[PDB]
JSON list of C-alpha atoms and ligand atoms in Angstrom, two decimals:
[
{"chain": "N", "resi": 1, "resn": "UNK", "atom": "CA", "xyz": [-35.48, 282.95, -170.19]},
{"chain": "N", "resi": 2, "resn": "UNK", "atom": "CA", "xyz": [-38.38, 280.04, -170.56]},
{"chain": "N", "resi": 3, "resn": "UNK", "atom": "CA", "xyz": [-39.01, 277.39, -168.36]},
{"chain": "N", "resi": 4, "resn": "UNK", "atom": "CA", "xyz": [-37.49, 273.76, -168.84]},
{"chain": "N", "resi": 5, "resn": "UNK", "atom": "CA", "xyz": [-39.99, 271.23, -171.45]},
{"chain": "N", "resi": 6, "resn": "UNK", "atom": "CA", "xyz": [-42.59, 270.98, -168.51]},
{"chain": "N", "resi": 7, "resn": "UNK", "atom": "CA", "xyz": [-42.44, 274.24, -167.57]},
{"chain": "N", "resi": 8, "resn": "UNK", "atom": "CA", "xyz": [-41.58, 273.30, -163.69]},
{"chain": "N", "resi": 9, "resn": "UNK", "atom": "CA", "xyz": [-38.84, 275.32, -163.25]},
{"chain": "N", "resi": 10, "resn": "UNK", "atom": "CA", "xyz": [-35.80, 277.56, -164.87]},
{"chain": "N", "resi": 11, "resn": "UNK", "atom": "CA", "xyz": [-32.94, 276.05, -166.73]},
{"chain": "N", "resi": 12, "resn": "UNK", "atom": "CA", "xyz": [-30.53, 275.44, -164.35]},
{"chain": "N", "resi": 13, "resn": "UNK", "atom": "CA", "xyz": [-26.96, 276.27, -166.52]},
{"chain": "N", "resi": 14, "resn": "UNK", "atom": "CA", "xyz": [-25.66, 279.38, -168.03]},
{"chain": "N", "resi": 15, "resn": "UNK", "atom": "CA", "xyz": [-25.83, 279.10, -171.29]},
{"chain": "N", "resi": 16, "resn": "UNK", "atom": "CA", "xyz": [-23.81, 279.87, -174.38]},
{"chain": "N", "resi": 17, "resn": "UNK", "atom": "CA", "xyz": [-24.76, 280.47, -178.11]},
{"chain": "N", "resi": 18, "resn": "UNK", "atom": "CA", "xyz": [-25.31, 277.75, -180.60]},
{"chain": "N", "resi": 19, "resn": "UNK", "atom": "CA", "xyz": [-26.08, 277.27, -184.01]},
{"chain": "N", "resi": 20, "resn": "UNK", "atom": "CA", "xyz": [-29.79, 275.64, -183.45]},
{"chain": "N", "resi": 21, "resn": "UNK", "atom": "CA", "xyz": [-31.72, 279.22, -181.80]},
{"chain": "N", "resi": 22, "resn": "UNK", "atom": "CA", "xyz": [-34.40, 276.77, -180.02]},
{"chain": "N", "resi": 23, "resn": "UNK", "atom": "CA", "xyz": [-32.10, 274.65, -178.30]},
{"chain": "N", "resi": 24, "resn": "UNK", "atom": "CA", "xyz": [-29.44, 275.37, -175.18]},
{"chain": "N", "resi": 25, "resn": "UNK", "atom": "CA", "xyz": [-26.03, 275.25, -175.49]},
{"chain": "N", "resi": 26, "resn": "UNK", "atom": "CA", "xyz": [-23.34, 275.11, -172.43]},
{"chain": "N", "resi": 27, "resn": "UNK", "atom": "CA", "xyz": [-19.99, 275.25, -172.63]},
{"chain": "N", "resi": 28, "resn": "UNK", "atom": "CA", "xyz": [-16.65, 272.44, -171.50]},
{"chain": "N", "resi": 29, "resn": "UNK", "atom": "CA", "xyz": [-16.45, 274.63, -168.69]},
{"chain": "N", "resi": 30, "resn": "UNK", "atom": "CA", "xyz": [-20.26, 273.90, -167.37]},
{"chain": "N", "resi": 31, "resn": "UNK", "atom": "CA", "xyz": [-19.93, 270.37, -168.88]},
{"chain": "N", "resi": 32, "resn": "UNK", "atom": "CA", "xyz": [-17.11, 269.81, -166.34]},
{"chain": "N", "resi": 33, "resn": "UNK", "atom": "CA", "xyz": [-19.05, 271.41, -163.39]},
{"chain": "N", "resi": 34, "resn": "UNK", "atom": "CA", "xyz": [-21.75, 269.00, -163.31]},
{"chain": "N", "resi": 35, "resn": "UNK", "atom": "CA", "xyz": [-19.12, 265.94, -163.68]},
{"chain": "N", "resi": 36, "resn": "UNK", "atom": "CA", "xyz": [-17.31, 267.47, -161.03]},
{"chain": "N", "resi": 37, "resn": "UNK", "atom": "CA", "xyz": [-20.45, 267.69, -158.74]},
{"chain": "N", "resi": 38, "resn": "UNK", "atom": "CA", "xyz": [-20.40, 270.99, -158.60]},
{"chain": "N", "resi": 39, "resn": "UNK", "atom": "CA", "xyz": [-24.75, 270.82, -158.67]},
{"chain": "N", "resi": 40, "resn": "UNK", "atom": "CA", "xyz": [-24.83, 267.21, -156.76]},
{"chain": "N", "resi": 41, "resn": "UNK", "atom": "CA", "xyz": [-27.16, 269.57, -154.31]},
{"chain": "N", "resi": 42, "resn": "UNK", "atom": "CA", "xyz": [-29.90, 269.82, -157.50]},
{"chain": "N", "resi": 43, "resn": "UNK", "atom": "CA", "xyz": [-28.90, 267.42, -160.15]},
{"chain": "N", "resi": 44, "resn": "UNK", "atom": "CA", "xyz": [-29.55, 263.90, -158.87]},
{"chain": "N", "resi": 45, "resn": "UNK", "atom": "CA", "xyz": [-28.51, 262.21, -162.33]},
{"chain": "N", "resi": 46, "resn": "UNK", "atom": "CA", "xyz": [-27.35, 263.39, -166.04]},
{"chain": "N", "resi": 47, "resn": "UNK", "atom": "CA", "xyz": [-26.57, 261.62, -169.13]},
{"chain": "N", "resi": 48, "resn": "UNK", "atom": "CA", "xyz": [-24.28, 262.61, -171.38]},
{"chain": "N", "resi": 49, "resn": "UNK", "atom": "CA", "xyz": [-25.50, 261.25, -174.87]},
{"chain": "N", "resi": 50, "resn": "UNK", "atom": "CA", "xyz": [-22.48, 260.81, -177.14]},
{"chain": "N", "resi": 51, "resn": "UNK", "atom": "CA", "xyz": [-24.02, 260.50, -180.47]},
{"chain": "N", "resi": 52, "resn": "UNK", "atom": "CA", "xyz": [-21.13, 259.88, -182.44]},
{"chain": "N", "resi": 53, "resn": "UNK", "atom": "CA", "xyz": [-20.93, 256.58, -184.15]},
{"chain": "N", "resi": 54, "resn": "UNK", "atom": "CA", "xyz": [-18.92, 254.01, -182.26]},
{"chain": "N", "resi": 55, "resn": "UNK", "atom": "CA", "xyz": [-15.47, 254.08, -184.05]},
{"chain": "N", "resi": 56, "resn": "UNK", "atom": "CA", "xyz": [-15.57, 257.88, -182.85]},
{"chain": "N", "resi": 57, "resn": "UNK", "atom": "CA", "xyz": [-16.74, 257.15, -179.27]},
{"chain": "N", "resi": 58, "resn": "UNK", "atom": "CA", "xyz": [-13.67, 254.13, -179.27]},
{"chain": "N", "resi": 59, "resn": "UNK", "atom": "CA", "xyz": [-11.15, 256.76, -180.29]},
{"chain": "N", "resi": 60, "resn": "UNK", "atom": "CA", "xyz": [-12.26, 258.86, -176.75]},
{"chain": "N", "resi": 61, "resn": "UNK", "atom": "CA", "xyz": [-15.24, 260.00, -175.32]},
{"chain": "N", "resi": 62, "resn": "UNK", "atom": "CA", "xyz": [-16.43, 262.42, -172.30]},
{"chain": "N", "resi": 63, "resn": "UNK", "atom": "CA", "xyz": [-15.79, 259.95, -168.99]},
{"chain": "N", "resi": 64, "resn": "UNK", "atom": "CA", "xyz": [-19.07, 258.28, -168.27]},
{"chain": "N", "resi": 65, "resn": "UNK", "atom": "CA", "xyz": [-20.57, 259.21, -171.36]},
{"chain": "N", "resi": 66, "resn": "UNK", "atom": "CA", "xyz": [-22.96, 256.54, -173.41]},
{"chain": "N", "resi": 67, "resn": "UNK", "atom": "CA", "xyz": [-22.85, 256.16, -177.34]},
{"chain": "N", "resi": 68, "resn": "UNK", "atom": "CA", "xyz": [-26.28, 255.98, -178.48]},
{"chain": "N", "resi": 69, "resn": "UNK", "atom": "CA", "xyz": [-25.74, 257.14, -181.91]},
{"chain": "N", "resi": 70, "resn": "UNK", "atom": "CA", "xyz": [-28.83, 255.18, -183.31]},
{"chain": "N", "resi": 71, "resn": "UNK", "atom": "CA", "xyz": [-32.44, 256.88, -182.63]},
{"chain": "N", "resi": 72, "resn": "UNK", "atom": "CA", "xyz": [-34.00, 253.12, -181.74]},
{"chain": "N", "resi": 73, "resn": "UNK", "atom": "CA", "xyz": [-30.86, 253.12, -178.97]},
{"chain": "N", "resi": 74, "resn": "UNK", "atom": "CA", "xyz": [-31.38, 256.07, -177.80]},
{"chain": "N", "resi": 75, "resn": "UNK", "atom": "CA", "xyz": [-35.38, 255.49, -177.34]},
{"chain": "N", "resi": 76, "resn": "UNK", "atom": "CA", "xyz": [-34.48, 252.56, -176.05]},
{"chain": "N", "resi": 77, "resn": "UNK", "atom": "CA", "xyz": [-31.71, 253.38, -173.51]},
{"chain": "N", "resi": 78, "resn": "UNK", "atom": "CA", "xyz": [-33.39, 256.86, -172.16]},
{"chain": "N", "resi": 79, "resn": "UNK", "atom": "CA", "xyz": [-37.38, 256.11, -172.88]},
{"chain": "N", "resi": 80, "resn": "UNK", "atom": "CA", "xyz": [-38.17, 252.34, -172.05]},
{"chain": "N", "resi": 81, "resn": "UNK", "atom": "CA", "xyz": [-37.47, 252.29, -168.62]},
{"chain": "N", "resi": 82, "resn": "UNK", "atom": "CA", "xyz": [-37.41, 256.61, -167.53]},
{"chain": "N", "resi": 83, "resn": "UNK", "atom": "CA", "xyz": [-34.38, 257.34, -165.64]},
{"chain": "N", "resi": 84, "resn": "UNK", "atom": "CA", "xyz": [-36.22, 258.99, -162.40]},
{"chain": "N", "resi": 85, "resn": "UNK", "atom": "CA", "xyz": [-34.73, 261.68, -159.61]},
{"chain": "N", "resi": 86, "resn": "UNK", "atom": "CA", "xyz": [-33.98, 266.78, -157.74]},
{"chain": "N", "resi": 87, "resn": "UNK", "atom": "CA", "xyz": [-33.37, 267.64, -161.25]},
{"chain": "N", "resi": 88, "resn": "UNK", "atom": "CA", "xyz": [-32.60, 264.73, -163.87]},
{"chain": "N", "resi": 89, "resn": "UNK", "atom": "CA", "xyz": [-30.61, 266.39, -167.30]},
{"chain": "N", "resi": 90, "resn": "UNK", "atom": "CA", "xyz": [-29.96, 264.91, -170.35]},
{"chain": "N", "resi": 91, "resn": "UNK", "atom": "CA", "xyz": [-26.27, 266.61, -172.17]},
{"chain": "N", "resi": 92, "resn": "UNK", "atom": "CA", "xyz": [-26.45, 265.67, -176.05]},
{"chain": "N", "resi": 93, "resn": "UNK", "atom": "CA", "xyz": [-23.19, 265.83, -178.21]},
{"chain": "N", "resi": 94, "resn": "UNK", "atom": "CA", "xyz": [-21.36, 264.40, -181.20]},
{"chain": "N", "resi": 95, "resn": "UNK", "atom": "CA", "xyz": [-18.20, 265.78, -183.26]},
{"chain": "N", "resi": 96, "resn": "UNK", "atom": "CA", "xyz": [-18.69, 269.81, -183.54]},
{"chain": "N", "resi": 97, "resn": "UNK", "atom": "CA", "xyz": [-22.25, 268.89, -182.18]},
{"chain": "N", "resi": 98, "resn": "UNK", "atom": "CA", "xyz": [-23.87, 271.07, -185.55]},
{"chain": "N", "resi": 99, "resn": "UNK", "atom": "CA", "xyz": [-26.07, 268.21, -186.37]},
{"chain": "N", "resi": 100, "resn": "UNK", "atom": "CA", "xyz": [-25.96, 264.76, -184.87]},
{"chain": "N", "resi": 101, "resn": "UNK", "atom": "CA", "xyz": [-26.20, 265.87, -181.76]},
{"chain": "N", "resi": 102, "resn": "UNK", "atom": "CA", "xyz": [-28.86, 268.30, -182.50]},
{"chain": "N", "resi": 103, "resn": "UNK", "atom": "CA", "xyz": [-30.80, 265.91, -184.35]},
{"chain": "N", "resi": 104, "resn": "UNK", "atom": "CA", "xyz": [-30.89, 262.93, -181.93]},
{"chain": "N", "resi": 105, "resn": "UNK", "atom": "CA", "xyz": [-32.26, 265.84, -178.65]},
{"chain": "N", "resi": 106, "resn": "UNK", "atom": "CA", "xyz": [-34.72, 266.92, -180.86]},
{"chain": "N", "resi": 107, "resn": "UNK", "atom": "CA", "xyz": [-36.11, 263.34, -181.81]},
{"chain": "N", "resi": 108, "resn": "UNK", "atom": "CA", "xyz": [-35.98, 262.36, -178.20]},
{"chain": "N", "resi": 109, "resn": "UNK", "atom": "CA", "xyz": [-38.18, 265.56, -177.33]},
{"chain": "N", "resi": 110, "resn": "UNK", "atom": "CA", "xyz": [-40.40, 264.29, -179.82]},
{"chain": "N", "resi": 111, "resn": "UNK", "atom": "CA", "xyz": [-40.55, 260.82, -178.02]},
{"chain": "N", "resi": 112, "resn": "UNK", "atom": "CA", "xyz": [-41.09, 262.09, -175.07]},
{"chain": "N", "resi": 113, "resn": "UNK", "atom": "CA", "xyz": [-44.10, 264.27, -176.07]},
{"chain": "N", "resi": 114, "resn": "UNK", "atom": "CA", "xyz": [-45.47, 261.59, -177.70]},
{"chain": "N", "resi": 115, "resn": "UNK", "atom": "CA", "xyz": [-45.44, 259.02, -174.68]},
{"chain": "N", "resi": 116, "resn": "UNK", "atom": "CA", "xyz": [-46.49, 261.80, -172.22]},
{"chain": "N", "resi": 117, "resn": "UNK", "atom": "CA", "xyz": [-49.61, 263.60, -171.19]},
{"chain": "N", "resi": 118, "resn": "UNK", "atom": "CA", "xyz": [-49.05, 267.78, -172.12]},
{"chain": "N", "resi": 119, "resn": "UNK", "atom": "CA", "xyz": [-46.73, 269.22, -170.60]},
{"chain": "N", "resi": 120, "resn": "UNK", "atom": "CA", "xyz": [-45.10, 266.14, -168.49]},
{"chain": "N", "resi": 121, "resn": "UNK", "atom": "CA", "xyz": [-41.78, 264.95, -169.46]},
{"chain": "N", "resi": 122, "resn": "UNK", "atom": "CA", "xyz": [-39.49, 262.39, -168.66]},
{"chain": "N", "resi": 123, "resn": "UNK", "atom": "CA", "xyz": [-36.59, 264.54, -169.45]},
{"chain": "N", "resi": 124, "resn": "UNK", "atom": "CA", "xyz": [-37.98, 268.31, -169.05]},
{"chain": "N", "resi": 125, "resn": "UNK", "atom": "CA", "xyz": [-34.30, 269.90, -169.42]},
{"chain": "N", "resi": 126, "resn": "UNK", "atom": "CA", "xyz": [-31.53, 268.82, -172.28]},
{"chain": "N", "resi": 127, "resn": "UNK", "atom": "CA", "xyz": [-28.54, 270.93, -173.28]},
{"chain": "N", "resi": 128, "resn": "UNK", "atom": "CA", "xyz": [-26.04, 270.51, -176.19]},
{"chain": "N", "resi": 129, "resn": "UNK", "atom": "CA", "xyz": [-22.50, 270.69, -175.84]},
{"chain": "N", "resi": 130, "resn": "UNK", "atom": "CA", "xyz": [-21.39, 273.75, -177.65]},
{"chain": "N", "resi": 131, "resn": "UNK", "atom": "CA", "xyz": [-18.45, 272.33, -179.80]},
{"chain": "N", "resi": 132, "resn": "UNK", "atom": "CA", "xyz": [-18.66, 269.09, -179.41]},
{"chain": "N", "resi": 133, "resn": "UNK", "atom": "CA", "xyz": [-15.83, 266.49, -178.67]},
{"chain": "N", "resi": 134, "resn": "UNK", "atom": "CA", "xyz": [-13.95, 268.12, -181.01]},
{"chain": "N", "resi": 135, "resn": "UNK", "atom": "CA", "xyz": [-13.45, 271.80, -178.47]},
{"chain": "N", "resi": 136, "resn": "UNK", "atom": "CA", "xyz": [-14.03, 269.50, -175.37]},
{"chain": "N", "resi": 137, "resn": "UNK", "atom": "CA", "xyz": [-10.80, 267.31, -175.35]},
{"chain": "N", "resi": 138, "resn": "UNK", "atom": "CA", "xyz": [-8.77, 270.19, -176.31]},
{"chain": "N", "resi": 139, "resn": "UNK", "atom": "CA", "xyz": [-10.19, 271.79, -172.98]},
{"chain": "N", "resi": 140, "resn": "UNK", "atom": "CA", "xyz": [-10.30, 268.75, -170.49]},
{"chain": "N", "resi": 141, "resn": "UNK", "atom": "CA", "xyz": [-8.16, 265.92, -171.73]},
{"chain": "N", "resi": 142, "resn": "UNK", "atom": "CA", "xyz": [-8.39, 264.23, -168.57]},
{"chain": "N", "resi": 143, "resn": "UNK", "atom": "CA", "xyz": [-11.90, 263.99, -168.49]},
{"chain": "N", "resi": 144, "resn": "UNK", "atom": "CA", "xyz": [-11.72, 261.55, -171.49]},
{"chain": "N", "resi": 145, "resn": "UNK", "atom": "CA", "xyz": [-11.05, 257.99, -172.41]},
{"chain": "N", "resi": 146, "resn": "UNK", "atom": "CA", "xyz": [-8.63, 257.32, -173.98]},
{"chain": "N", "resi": 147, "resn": "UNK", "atom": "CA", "xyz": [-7.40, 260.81, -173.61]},
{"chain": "N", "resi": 148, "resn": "UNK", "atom": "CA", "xyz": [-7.66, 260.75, -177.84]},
{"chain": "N", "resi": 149, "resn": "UNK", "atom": "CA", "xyz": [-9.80, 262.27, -180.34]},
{"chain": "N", "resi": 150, "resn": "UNK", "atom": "CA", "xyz": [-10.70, 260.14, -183.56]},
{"chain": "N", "resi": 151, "resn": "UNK", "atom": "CA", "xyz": [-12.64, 262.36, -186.23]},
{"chain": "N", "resi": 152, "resn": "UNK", "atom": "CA", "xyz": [-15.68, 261.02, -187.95]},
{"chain": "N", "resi": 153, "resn": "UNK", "atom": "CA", "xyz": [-13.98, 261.42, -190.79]},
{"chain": "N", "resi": 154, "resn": "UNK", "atom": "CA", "xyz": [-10.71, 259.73, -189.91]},
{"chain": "N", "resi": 155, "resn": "UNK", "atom": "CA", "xyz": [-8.88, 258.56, -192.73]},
{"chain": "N", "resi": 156, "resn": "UNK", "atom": "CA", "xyz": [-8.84, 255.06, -191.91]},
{"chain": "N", "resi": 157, "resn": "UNK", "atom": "CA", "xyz": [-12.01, 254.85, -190.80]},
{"chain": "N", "resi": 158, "resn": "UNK", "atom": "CA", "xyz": [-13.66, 255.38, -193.93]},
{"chain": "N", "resi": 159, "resn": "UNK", "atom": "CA", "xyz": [-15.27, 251.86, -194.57]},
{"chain": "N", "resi": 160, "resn": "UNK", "atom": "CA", "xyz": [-16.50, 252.13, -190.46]},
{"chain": "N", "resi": 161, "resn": "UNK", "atom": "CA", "xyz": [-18.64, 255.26, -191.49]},
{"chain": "N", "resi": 162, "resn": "UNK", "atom": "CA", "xyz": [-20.30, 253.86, -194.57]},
{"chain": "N", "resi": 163, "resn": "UNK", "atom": "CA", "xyz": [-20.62, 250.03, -192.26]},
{"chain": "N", "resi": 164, "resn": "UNK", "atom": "CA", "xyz": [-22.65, 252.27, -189.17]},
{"chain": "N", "resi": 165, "resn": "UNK", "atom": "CA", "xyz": [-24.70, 254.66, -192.06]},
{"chain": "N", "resi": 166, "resn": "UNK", "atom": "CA", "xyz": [-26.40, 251.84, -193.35]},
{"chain": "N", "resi": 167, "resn": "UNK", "atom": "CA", "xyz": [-27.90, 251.20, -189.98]},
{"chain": "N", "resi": 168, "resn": "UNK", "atom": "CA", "xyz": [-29.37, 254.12, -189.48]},
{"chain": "N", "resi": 169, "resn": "UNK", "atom": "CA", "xyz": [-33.22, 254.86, -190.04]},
{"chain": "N", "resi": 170, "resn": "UNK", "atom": "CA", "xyz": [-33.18, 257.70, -192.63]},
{"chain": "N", "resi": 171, "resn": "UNK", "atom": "CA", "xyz": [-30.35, 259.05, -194.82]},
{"chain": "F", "resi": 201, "resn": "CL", "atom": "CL1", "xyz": [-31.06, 256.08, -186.61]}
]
């Protein structure tokens, strides 16, 4: 298997298969190692990126996980000021994590290209969570908050999607 994005080291999880062939996929199991400390020897800090939009992440979310559903937020959050280590991961995710989450690593590989000198990285190594919240909470309920699940497309939630969608940079 390839190195990480600046080719420093190996990928540190096992991986499972996803949908996007590129990109690496763990699984709630592995998710649930590192937030049980299980690589505190290697890892000195991950993120786990909900990009959901925030009626979702309200509804329950991974424990210490940050919404940053919105590319300018997630720039902003993970690029302005470089979280710095030791290994440093970045875990993106969102519903079934098919496209969201997806979307919002690969933009934030893009920024970091973009602000770095080839092949430095702020954030060499970023997974997906294979499933989403959707197969996580089923998994590790108590690893969420609120121990809840509220779908994207929730039924009374329906005037919160459209509200969030029209913030967004590109439809
Ligand atoms: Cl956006």
């Amino acid at each position: 298997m390839e190195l990480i994005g600046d080719y420093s080291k190996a990928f540190l999880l096992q991986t499972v298969d996803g949908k996007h062939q590129d990109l690496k996929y763990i699984s709630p199991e592995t998710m649930v190692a590192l937030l049980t400390g299980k690589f505190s020897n290697i890892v000195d800090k991950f993120v786990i990126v909900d990009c959901r939009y925030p009626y979702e992440y309200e509804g329950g979310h991974i424990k210490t996980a940050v919404n940053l559903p919105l590319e300018r937020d997630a720039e902003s959050f993970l690029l302005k000021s470089p979280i710095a280590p030791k290994r440093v991961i970045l875990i993106f995710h969102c519903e079934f994590s098919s496209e969201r989450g997806p979307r919002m690593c690969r933009f934030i590989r893009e920024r970091d290209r973009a602000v770095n000198d080839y092949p430095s990285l702020y954030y060499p190594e970023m997974y997906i969570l294979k499933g989403g919240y959707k197969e996580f909470f089923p998994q590790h309920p108590n690893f969420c908050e609120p121990q809840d699940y509220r779908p994207m497309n929730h039924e009374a939630f329906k005037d919160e999607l459209k509200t969030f969608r029209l913030k967004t940079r590109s439809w």
